[PDB]
Amino acid sequence: MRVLLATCGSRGDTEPLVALAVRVRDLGADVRMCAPPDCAERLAEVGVPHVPVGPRAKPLTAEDVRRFTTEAIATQFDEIPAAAEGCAAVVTTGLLAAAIGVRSVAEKLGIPYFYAFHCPSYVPSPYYPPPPIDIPAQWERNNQSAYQRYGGLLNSHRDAIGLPPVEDIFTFGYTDHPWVAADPVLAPLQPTDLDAVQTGAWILPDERPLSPELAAFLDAGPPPVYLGFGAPADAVRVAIDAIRAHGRRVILSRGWADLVLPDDGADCFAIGEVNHQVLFGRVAAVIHHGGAGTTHVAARAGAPQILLPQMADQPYYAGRVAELGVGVAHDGPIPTFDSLSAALATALTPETHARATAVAGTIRTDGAAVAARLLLDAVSRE
């Protein structure tokens, strides 16, 4: 029995599916993953068969957006059929435009399709509004909006392969039994009329040791603050100013090695490839945008967090960090010296550290295995 894992390419979508792939294989099943050519390296690391699929100087226009949409859907119909050859099921996450194409191909082949969310707030429900009679209407409104953008294209493609038209994009793309690949403590699934199942995040343990240089920097002083931002150089410089004002050194995520600094930058260490699972257990706090993955890794590592949400599910995770008392939900998406200094004052307290440490022990790490089991049992019901 072989399972197909389909992904658009983002590391945020790719890694969780890689985790599921490995856990499904751990159970004796075969796996194959369709992803951008650039995922070849990572997939080679875990020995997961890779089917390369899918992928400026001028502003974007509505015409451009419509083209990315049209081609996102077409790519699924054009390449998933071959990738799904010899497969008993297909699992995907992410972009709705792509997901509806993947499910349509699964439907044509007569194999079960599964969808997973990385944030529970995106799961349709009549009990809470969608990411910003009434509530239901709100979700239907967005669902109608999705149809206006994808419906015509989807059904045109479906006509070509003899499948009936879809009228409800959300139910079709997400299914009425979506999985929520997020931790039940960090991101609790809320009431809904859908048969959603919360498995825990899909993350594999990272065994890579820290580089000798990074380790040496860490041992050369008190635990530093990790700054992980893309972002404007001035925003990073302000963040560094605030961290320094709290007497802490800085670890800069990959990409800032050449950032120009005001005062001597000897207290700033810029890293390349790194084991975040381990690094996060050695810092005083982590400052980032609030993506599902980073928030989960930092939470399990017990690191106090400061989130500056920008898009998608980031505002959700920023809110959860504040509610759990393991960090601060920074107001704006860009920091100022005063706003970040205020956040650090709260995040660096012994109380916040104790809380982050306690919560960390309750974050589960077997979510991918949980999903793998549910998947195989479902496939066995076919």
Q: How far is the CB of 72 from Mg ion (least distance, A)?
A: 11
Nearer to Mg ion by Cβ, of 44 and 161: the residue is 161
Q: How far is the CB of 147 from Mg ion (least distance, A)?
A: 14
* Burial track 338-366 (b if 16+ CB lie within 10 A, e otherwise): ebbbbbbebbbeeebbebbeebbeebebe
Q: How far is the CB of 155 from Mg ion (least distance, A)?
A: 5
Nearer to Mg ion by Cβ, of 158 and 330: the residue is 158
Nearer to Mg ion by Cβ, of 153 and 240: the residue is 153
Nearest alpha-carbon partner for 143 in 113, 163, 170, 122: 170
Nearer to Mg ion by Cβ, of 93 and 155: the residue is 155
At 285 the three-state DSSP class reads strand
Contacts of 31 (CB under 8 A, 6+ apart): 2, 3, 4, 5, 21, 22, 24, 25, 48, 49
Residues that bind Mg ion (CB under 5 A): 78, 159
Nearer to Mg ion by Cβ, of 64 and 159: the residue is 159
Instruction: Answer whether 1's CB lies under 8 Å from 379's CB.
Output: yes
Nearer to Mg ion by Cβ, of 52 and 130: the residue is 52
Angstrom distances, CA of residue 221 to CA of 81, 224, 268: 55, 8, 12
Q: How far is the CB of 149 from Mg ion (least distance, A)?
A: 17
* Assigned token pair, 378: 């479902």
Angstrom distances, CA of residue 137 to CA of 123, 132, 140, 190, 353: 15, 14, 5, 18, 42
Q: How far is the CB of 88 from Mg ion (least distance, A)?
A: 26
Q: How far is the CB of 350 from Mg ion (least distance, A)?
A: 57
